[PDB]
Design a protein around this ligand. Structure first.
Ligand SMILES: [Ca+2]
Ligand SMILES: [Ca+2]
Ligand SMILES: [Ca+2]
Ligand SMILES: [Ca+2]
Ligand SMILES: [Zn+2]
Length: 316
């Protein structure tokens, strides 16, 4: 909408106070004019018609319980925007400052969030398995990263290219988490998962096996469920990514960690310059080695660490 940029205040899903960029025109809308061609957040009002209505508030204060998922979807989209712009010089998900649109209050007791080709969509959870999913910055950035992938490599959402697609989202989801520096970890979804149980999550990058996911190629899932295991076999790549960043010894193979920023630069370069819609795991390894070469040189520690990491997860 047309109006004037203002700054509202509210509380997110976890009860934390934050400022948000809004737009005034009779009401105050969740429309952030400070990033690209705008960040826009919508109310799906418990239904599944999208995007729903642009979020409007009478007083620019967003402390109602119903407000909290909107507050975080809006805020964490901006954090994710900032990550990609400041760290990777990428302007929004298409690289040309496309408007980032999100809808919250999607459906009833909906235990999931997703990018639907055009926008972000967040359920409120059923309150047992999940609370509103926009509460999790890694969830927000994971899903926004699918838009980035769709506009770059375009990894098909099935089998190995699909699992790479998933891993890429968990990797940058995690790096955004660290970027914001609020209780960062290498697990996914912990902030909005099972409010009655502490210490768990949907997935773990550092030990995928903690939630039944493979951490080696020889353990990969090869059935037809989950589009050929995209959220399962992602563990193998996530493991490799963890090892490149933090290092360790996995099934006897030692990896010297190079840190998150370099992991981020190598995988960003791989995603945007070498990967393709049908890339398999072995092709990901080569893209990663080639990217670290570009960035650090053939003889760098960095290149060596990348090869060690993929060796460690059985990917040649
Ligand atoms: Ca209000
Ligand atoms: Ca965390
Ligand atoms: Ca996390
Ligand atoms: Ca939990
Ligand atoms: Zn995903």
């Amino acid at each position: 909408i047309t109006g004037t940029s203002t700054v509202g205040v509210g509380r997110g899903v976890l009860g934390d106070q934050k400022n948000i960029n809004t737009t005034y025109s009779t009401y105050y809308y969740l429309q952030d004019n400070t990033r690209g061609n705008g960040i826009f957040t919508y109310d799906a009002k418990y239904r599944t018609t999208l995007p729903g209505s642009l979020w409007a508030d009478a007083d620019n204060q967003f402390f109602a319980s119903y407000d909290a998922p909107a507050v975080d979807a809006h805020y964490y989209a901006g954090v994710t925007y900032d990550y990609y712009k400041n760290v990777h010089n990428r302007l929004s998900y298409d690289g040309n400052n496309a408007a980032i649109r999100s809808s919250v209050h999607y459906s009833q007791g909906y235990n999931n969030a997703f990018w639907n080709g055009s926008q972000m969509v967040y359920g409120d959870g059923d309150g047992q398995t999940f609370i509103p999913l926009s509460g999790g910055i890694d969830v927000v950035a994971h899903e926004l990263t699918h838009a980035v992938t769709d506009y770059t490599a375009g990894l098909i959402y099935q089998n190995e290219s699909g699992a790479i697609n998933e891993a890429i989202s968990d990797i940058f989801g995690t790096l955004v988490e660290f970027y914001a520096n609020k209780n960062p970890d290498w697990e996914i979804g912990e902030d909005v998962y099972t409010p009655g149980i502490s210490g768990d999550s949907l997935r773990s990058m550092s030990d995928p096996a903690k939630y039944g996911d493979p951490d080696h190629y020889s353990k990969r899932y090869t059935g037809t469920q989950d589009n050929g295991g995209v959220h399962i076999n992602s563990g193998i790549i996530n493991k490799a990514a963890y090892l490149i960043s933090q290092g360790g010894t996995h099934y006897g193979v030692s990896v010297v960690g190079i840190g998150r920023d370099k992991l981020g630069k190598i995988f960003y370069r791989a995603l945007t310059q070498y990967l393709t819609p049908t890339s398999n795991f072995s092709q990901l390894r080569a893209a990663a080695v080639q990217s670290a070469t570009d960035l650090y040189g053939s003889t760098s520690q960095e290149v060596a660490s990348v090869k060690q990491a993929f060796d460690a997860v059985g990917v040649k």
